[PDB]
Symmetry: C2
Subunit: 227 residues, 2 copies
Amino acid sequence: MLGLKTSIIGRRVIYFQEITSTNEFAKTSYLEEGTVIVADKQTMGESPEGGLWLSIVLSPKVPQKDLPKIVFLGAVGVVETLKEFSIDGRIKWPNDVLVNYKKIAGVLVEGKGDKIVLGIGLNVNNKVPNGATSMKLELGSEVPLLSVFRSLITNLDRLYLNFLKNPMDILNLVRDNMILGVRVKILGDGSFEGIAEDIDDFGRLIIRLDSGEVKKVIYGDVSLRFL
Amino acid sequence: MLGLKTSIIGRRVIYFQEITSTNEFAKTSYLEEGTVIVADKQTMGHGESPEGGLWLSIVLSPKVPQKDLPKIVFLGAVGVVETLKEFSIDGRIKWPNDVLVNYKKIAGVLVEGKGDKIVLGIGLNVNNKVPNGATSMKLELGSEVPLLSVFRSLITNLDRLYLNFLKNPMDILNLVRDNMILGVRVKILGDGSFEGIAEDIDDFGRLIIRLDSGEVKKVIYGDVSLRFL
C-alpha cells in the first residue's frame, strides 16, 4: 500500500506504533538488506508522534573504511528530500541537518556484525525543543508523513545504489551540502576549538586549531557547535 | 508513520512492494499475533491482484473454542463492511466470505490455518482495475481513495472486532447476519447442486436454505460457493 518504487532500500518496511528505538530493533533482529523500520514514536530514542523516525539495514560490499560514509548518505538524503518540500537544509558535521541554524534532523549510524544500521530522525509535524525546528514550522503547515517517507526512502535508495558502485562520490556531494570554513567547538574527543576546513576520505573532520596544529576528528563520540 | 492506535491487530505491520500472496507469507513466516502483512501487488493472490488494491493478511492465535474458529472469516467480512460504511459505501456480505456492492464483488476474505496460527486474508478493490462484474471503492466513489486511509480504518475496525470476538464469538456471528444478503434466491454447489432462498445462518455459521422443493438444508462453507440468481 506504500507504493515504493525503489530497488534496495524499502523492499521491506516494518512499522511499529511504538518501540524503544528503531535502531535498537534493527540491531537486535535479523532483517534483509534494505529493510526500513519505522515507528510513530520512540520510547528511548522520547521521539514524539508527528516526526519521521526510521532505521535502514544495509550491508554494502565495500571496503571496511568506506563504511563511515553511510552517515553522510543519510544526511544528504534528508537535504534532498527537504529541497523537494522547498526547504534549504545544511549539514553540520557529522550527522545533523540544520535549517537556518536550527536542527531539523539527525542521523545515527551503528554497526552490528556484517550489517550497518542507518538511523534517521526528522522533525516533521512533531513538537520540538527550543533551538530546533520542523518541516511544519518551516512551511507553516502540517505535511503528510507518508509523502516525506516516500521521498526520503526513494532518495536514499538512489544514493545507496550509487554508493555501492562508487563509494568516493558521496564525499563531494556531502561537501557541497556541509557547513565548512567556519569556527567550531568539538564536543567529545579532544574538545578542540578551531576552523573546520574539510572532511577526509574517511569522513574525519579536518580542523585547524588556534595553535596552528591541524587535527582529524573521527565520527562516533562527537558533535559540533558553531562559534 | 502510519498512525495506528490499536491493541492487538496492527501492532506490527510488514509491507512488501510485491509478493506471491500475503497469506502465503503469513503462513511461512513466524510472526507475533496481530502482525499485518500488506503488499502493493500479489502475483498469486490469496486473501491478478493489481497495484491499487488493499491486499493484506493478519496473523491470529485466538484463545477461543474450536467450534468458533470458523467465525474468523465472518470477522474479516464484517470489518470490511464497517470500513466501507465509513467511506459511505453500502457493502453487504455474500456468505461466507465476499462483500458486494450493488451485487458486484468489492472484497473477498480467505482464512487459512496452520497449527495454532490462523491467517486472516483480505483483498479489497480500492483503486486497482477489477475483473468483469466486480467493483472498487474508486469506481463507487468517483475518484482515487488513499490506501493508507482505508488501511487505518480497516485495521482499526478489525482490532475492535477481534477483541470483542475473544470475549464473545457469538457477537461476530450476529454482526455477520445483520450485514448479510438474505431473503433472496441463491444457487449452492459442492456435494451437489441446488437452488433456494437463503434465509438465515445458524450459530456455527451454516447457511440455512429453503429449496424450491420445500426442503430446508444447512450448509457448511468453504464446502460451498454461492451465486445469487
